[PDB]
Amino acid sequence: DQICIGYHANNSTEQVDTIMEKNVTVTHAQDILEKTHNGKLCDLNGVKPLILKDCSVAGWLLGNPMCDEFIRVPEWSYIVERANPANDLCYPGSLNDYEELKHLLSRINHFEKILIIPKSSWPNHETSLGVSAACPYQGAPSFFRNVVWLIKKNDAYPTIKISYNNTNREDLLILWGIHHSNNAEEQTNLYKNPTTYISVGTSTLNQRLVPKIATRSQVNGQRGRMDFFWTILKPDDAIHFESNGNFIAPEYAYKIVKKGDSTIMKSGVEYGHCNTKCQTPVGAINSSMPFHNIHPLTIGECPKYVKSNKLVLATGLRNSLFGAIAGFIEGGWQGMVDGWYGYHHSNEQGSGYAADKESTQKAIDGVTNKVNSIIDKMNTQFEAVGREFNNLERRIENLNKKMEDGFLDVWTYNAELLVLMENERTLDFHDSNVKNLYDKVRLQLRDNAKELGNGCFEFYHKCDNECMESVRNGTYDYPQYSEEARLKRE
Amino acid sequence: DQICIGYHANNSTEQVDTIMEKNVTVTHAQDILEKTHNGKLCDLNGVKPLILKDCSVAGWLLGNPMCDEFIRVPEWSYIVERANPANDLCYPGSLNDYEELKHLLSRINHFEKILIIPKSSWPNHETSLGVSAACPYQGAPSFFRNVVWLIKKNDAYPTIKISYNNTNREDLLILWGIHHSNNAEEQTNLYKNPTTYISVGTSTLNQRLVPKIATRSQVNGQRGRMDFFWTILKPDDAIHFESNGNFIAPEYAYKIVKKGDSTIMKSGVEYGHCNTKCQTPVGAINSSMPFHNIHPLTIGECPKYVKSNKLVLATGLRNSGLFGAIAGFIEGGWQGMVDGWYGYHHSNEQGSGYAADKESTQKAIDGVTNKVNSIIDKMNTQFEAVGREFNNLERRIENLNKKMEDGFLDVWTYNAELLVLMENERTLDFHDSNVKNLYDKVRLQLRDNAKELGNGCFEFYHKCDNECMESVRNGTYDYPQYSEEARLKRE
Amino acid sequence: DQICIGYHANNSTEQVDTIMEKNVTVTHAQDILEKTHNGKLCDLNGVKPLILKDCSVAGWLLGNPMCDEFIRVPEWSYIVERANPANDLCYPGSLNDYEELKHLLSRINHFEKILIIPKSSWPNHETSLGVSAACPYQGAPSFFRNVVWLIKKNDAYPTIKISYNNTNREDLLILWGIHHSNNAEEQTNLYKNPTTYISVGTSTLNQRLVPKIATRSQVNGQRGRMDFFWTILKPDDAIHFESNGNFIAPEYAYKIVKKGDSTIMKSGVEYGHCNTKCQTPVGAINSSMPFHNIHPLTIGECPKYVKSNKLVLATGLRNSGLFGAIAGFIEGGWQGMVDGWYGYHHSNEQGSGYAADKESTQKAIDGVTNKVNSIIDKMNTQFEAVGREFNNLERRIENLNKKMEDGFLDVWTYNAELLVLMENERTLDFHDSNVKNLYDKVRLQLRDNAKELGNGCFEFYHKCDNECMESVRNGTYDYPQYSEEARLKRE
């Protein structure tokens, strides 16, 4: 002789945060943040990266004799470099526009080394005495591999005139250099002429260099210096050289065969023989969630980065404002396993739990729609990129550093605020549905039943399981049971 | 004998989107996105722009013999330049700090050309014979028109000392240059002196230049090069020149008569003899909408730019919820309902007809109207993109500039879309509650004198004419006077 | 017989704004925007700042004879410098990499000046004739105090070879310079040799300089120029000099003893004897509010800067979707009620008095405060502006810097105003729901023993005293015990 309505409860212990409350327990939830990595360096889509162990970019390109296992390299997906490489320019000096060169290296996937000037093209100079103790090889003085140090022969240094014509179909990378001597006497011992120069000219290049003879402090046990330069040669251009002395000549060059997407990564983790689709300087990520907090700089197809600790979305009602879930209904039911809103009946034939599948489905579609919307709306988000600056560009370096942290905080704020508000609306949405269900039954049985305070109703007239289906379907005939009602209400 | 409550509906098919639902049909809506353009270039508030057809900025300042239609130029509003101009420095070379000069040129709206150093000032050098085949004019050798190339006369090149003292009350722009020779023999053929120099000095400038002699590849048929420099002279300063050879001397200069706001646009569209108030590289914009999606770079008064495809607001009821009235115990709207969003249908014995609830429609009208205005005002301040240029060796800075401007357009696009989704959700429920409140207001006044059907209508126990049913819509329904009569019929 | 329902009211006149409506009057509201400053410069945390009165950073480091008040300085917290320092570089010239030096100075809190090259280490050269009328001192020619201008003694200028080794366990700052003559004749008078050079070399430095001789315009009273350079010498490193003319030798250097956080401020305000925790160029702020609108650039712990004019958070309900309770079906509030926000008034035969409801006012107060704290917590991290300087030929980079920090301020301003406007709308709803939810509880329990009247209160046909009728606030009522006589009470 009773019909009652309620909601479904379970053993869940998930907890979400709203604007006005924290640690609220819900029946069903799913996390959307990734916090784990494998702690290794692994292949990107089946292509091994290029790992420069203890060499800088300059040491590899100029051919530092100490680390020369990189004489020939296959294709690479990205470049890995340590924080402070040990083997760099061995003879003290510098490389002009070092940072601008490394920006070019981030868009190249393959190099090919070719020989452009054989050593036989220096008949009137000495090509075998350019060794130095600052660049040792197996305990003996040596020098760089891709360049030649020319000194006088038979007490003379005739002027040099040479040219190269690019006949390939790709661009070339060329490097040369100049030497700064110590004193006037040392200048004549190496190159006979007392005043020297170097001039280089292409279709867009025009240069002249003069040595600086002065006194400097010892670096690696030497007081001399060497400066290096580079350029890109077009497929049908030519380059011309001319010098009197202090010249470091090119021997080998690089062809740019494949152009693509890559990065230079600073890390110290070991190679681990894997395959993956997302890589970070601290490890690899394998997940399908839309957010992660591992590291700001990544390569590949990755989830977006936020500086958060947790991000949980609620997909169920409050576990056990229209005042229905908390009030008029003390708590949920464990017996109603199937649905989310349902009925409980008390009858002479028996009792049981029944669920309203129609209203249950409407809620599932409504919330699943919302969840897929949050993933979509955050598709476009700031992606960090690495840039480098030298010691006299501190102003620009600071400007770059603040711009990237500025966007990181904006998107972290947006993600955290969005989760908080949608966790609140979901809980109100579930509450409203149960309130509307209560009214639907109430309007049908206008006077044939009385309210019992809680969700239950007690019937004036006697009925069996049949008209239980009538009320829940809405097919309750008020005039049919109009009699047997006034008699009870005596 | 019977009264009922309902809401207004029509035949519109406009659709909007909320956070929880998509393709929801509404009675009324509003669009806030502009997606059309003229496809032409027009005057900005009545000032014609300056079109450099196949001529670069450098080819216009230094007078390239081909770009001779720009000798005299009136006032302009903005400058239009093609992507890859054909006519540029004809003789091979470069212009120092080209990008910084273009940044300065974006704040100037008029110029005037004056003759600072007449050609009679050089009586011991050859003013003619400075032509070349790299700069042709009507099939004959020529040279830049705003500078002069000086060559030896009578096998001698005396040293030059000259000065100019600004007295025009406005700033001046001056250009000069140096020539690099091919070989040693060429140097003596033209200038007669083996070693040369150029020195220029002002209150803030101290410069010395030396030619470089080397072998270079052919460009435009010539292996020589020419480099040019520029400076700005304050209203009462002076400039001093001294040279031994290889000197390209100034002849004309520009006065900065007018200053203001301008820009340089890269486009290929054609002039349309029209007028406008907003201009984009792809066309002009006529609209009053808050947002647009034509192009990120604009000039003039313009709506804000977003990278979206549709933005529709909702200002009406859902057409055929949280408060369970619009689609709950009220099944649907009334087609015959006009003159009001919410109202009552009356069906007494004297007659039957519809009616409208005044002062319930009006509050909803005022409520939604203020919501729209607040959204427009809150988005007045938005990031505006501006063009900048960098050379081949500034790739790191150029990359940094591009990422900054794309980052801000992503943020503001996210803000605009989120606001529209949320306010649409509130508006739908705002209409839902107002119907529910009206339904409850009648139920309390009526009390037990009527029996509620359960569909949104009430059936009167006591017979009541249009006068007392008008009193229900007054809210002056007098329960006691009809209370006793309804009793007897109740049984 | 009567027990009505109502809500608390007072005489407040605070106003808040929502999305739907502006100037809503509420009982209690907070303010979270600070708008006052003292207008003086104070000590940051008990450390007085360094105030350069009429000098520049260059004038202080290279001792300008006028700026002799700053010969020895104590530890500072930040540096104050006027807009256009009058005393700067008495002898016309320039300082190389000026802006990069100032950026380095922003992370230093203390210097110590030491002597490295005594005057006695210059025999065979003249050390007392290097004075000029451009640096006047007490109306008699003088020169910078940290460098020496060397002139020929007898009629010769022997070459110089000097070296210094850093053995101080701390980094050093060293300055030197070169002099550009006016004429060949003037060159021989000061230094006998006609062709000169300067060579400087460290572990990471390799430089060579040559004078430029030309005619220039008069700045101050002189046509000569001087160029100065600087470097940082790491511990256990040496610097080597060599020249034969036009050399401005170092005499004093600065040690870097304390590193930390500092800044350089462009202000014209005056020093007042006070200490603070936040400092702006306009004044000092002393408050606990979350936001402020004084100035973008600050130092110390400070509220976040926004560009708004008013940020008021509503905390109490309005004073005399929308659940119909507060403004409808309950006309106005109660002035007499003071104990809580919501409560029950009663009128028994014995007397009439107001009462209060706990567990309801408690949850409303608990809810509102949690919302306020979460707003403040969510704004913990926000963009903070820093100062940077660029010279005259870096206009593109300077414009880029301005647009970036302007864009971030508009983004964070938008978030603050949007967050407030939405929570104001939600809060006024929250009180409305509580009023109606209470009304359901009382109506539900008195199912038929009471006759609802529609004004918010119930009339019991039945009679019982304060022990029972008031016993309904506790939530305990026995329907059966009073059902019989209520049923027997019929007409």
Ligand SMILES: CC(=O)N[C@@H]1[C@@H](O[C@@H]2O[C@@H](C)[C@@H](O)[C@@H](O)[C@@H]2O)[C@H](O[C@@H]2O[C@H](CO)[C@H](O)[C@H](O[C@]3(C(=O)O)C[C@H](O)[C@@H](NC(C)=O)[C@H]([C@H](O)[C@H](O)CO)O3)[C@H]2O)[C@@H](CO)O[C@H]1O
């Ligand atoms: C105290 C003293 O004078 N000692 C002499 C040695 O010089 C000392 O040791 C070297 C390592 C430096 O630290 C010196 O500063 C120091 O005083 C001297 O060794 C030779 O000194 C000369 C000085 O100019 C030079 O450094 C020599 O360098 C070589 C080298 O690297 O070993 C020799 C190479 O063959 C040569 N390569 C050529 C010719 O292409 C170069 C070249 O000389 C310079 O690099 C040019 O800049 O490097 C160094 O060996 C010793 C003689 O063996 O005599 C000691 O009395």
Ligand SMILES: CC(=O)N[C@@H]1[C@@H](O[C@@H]2O[C@@H](C)[C@@H](O)[C@@H](O)[C@@H]2O)[C@H](O[C@@H]2O[C@H](CO)[C@H](O)[C@H](O[C@]3(C(=O)O)C[C@H](O)[C@@H](NC(C)=O)[C@H]([C@H](O)[C@H](O)CO)O3)[C@H]2O)[C@@H](CO)O[C@H]1O
């Ligand atoms: C050597 C050969 O096979 N051909 C000779 C011509 O040179 C060839 O054609 C020219 C266009 C270039 O491509 C050369 O590289 C090529 O070998 C030669 O023509 C003259 O060549 C000289 C080379 O220096 C020079 O280019 C002359 O060009 C002019 C010019 O630009 O038009 C002539 C002008 O009158 C002169 N102007 C002044 C102020 O004197 C300029 C100027 O001297 C230079 O630009 C300075 O850098 O040069 C070109 O006519 C031909 C005649 O000698 O002989 C062919 O055998």
Ligand SMILES: CC(=O)N[C@@H]1[C@@H](O[C@@H]2O[C@@H](C)[C@@H](O)[C@@H](O)[C@@H]2O)[C@H](O[C@@H]2O[C@H](CO)[C@H](O)[C@H](O[C@]3(C(=O)O)C[C@H](O)[C@@H](NC(C)=O)[C@H]([C@H](O)[C@H](O)CO)O3)[C@H]2O)[C@@H](CO)O[C@H]1O
């Ligand atoms: C009309 C005329 O010719 N007047 C001569 C004076 O020059 C005039 O006034 C000076 C201030 C300048 O404005 C000149 O451009 C102007 O014509 C001349 O005064 C001296 O002129 C010389 C050369 O032009 C030089 O500036 C002198 O400057 C001094 C100074 O400041 O007083 C003199 C110092 O002793 C000297 N210091 C050293 C270390 O030598 C420097 C000087 O600048 C150095 O030579 C470095 O450049 O400063 C200036 O007094 C006057 C001399 O008798 O003759 C007038 O006929």
Ligand SMILES: *[C@@H]1O[C@H](CO)[C@@H](O[C@@H]2O[C@H](CO)[C@@H](O)[C@H](O)[C@H]2NC(C)=O)[C@H](O)[C@H]1NC(C)=O
């Ligand atoms: C580099 O080699 C190219 C390629 O052969 C040469 O330029 C050629 O010049 C000849 C002369 O008429 C012509 O075949 C073409 O103008 C060029 N060749 C091609 C295939 O286009 C020249 O030797 C060098 N070019 C430069 C610019 O130095």
Ligand SMILES: *[C@@H]1O[C@H](CO)[C@@H](O[C@@H]2O[C@H](CO)[C@@H](O)[C@H](O)[C@H]2NC(C)=O)[C@H](O)[C@H]1NC(C)=O
């Ligand atoms: C440019 O000429 C003007 C006008 O002669 C110079 O300005 C001053 O003019 C007054 C007026 O007689 C005189 O004191 C001098 O002729 C000038 N004095 C000064 C201090 O400049 C100006 O000198 C000239 N420009 C320069 C820098 O030489």
Ligand SMILES: *[C@@H]1O[C@H](CO)[C@@H](O[C@@H]2O[C@H](CO)[C@@H](O)[C@H](O)[C@H]2NC(C)=O)[C@H](O)[C@H]1NC(C)=O
């Ligand atoms: C500055 O002087 C110090 C102390 O004399 C020098 O350091 C010594 O250098 C020599 C030669 O390299 C070594 O044998 C000593 O062991 C060093 N002593 C110490 C305490 O480091 C230093 O080299 C000098 N500076 C320079 C760059 O010449």
Ligand SMILES: *[C@@H]1O[C@H](CO)[C@@H](O)[C@H](O)[C@H]1NC(C)=O
């Ligand atoms: C929420 O619950 C977790 C789990 O114990 C706890 O660590 C955290 O402090 C709680 N937060 C609050 C505000 O109680």
Ligand SMILES: *[C@@H]1O[C@H](CO)[C@@H](O)[C@H](O)[C@H]1NC(C)=O
């Ligand atoms: C990623 O994780 C999934 C789930 O365990 C697994 O099936 C897949 O093999 C993993 N891929 C890699 C490359 O580790």
Ligand SMILES: *[C@@H]1O[C@H](CO)[C@@H](O)[C@H](O)[C@H]1NC(C)=O
């Ligand atoms: C909404 O309507 C658009 C346009 O008619 C259609 O392309 C889209 O698939 C619809 N979305 C859904 C969820 O039906």
Ligand SMILES: *[C@@H]1O[C@H](CO)[C@@H](O)[C@H](O)[C@H]1NC(C)=O
């Ligand atoms: C711009 O649009 C309006 C209508 O929006 C139209 O009346 C007007 O003629 C158009 N052209 C100009 C120049 O305003």
Ligand SMILES: *[C@@H]1O[C@H](CO)[C@@H](O)[C@H](O)[C@H]1NC(C)=O
């Ligand atoms: C309706 O109410 C108004 C009071 O606002 C009154 O003036 C008017 O006479 C009423 N109409 C009828 C028919 O009673």
Ligand SMILES: *[C@@H]1O[C@H](CO)[C@@H](O)[C@H](O)[C@H]1NC(C)=O
């Ligand atoms: C709200 O009231 C203030 C106080 O007088 C007034 O300045 C402001 O204009 C009012 N705003 C509106 C929208 O009425």
Ligand SMILES: *[C@@H]1O[C@H](CO)[C@@H](O)[C@H](O)[C@H]1NC(C)=O
């Ligand atoms: C700021 O104001 C408070 C409260 O009036 C006061 O106690 C405090 O001393 C003030 N701070 C300073 C630095 O004067």
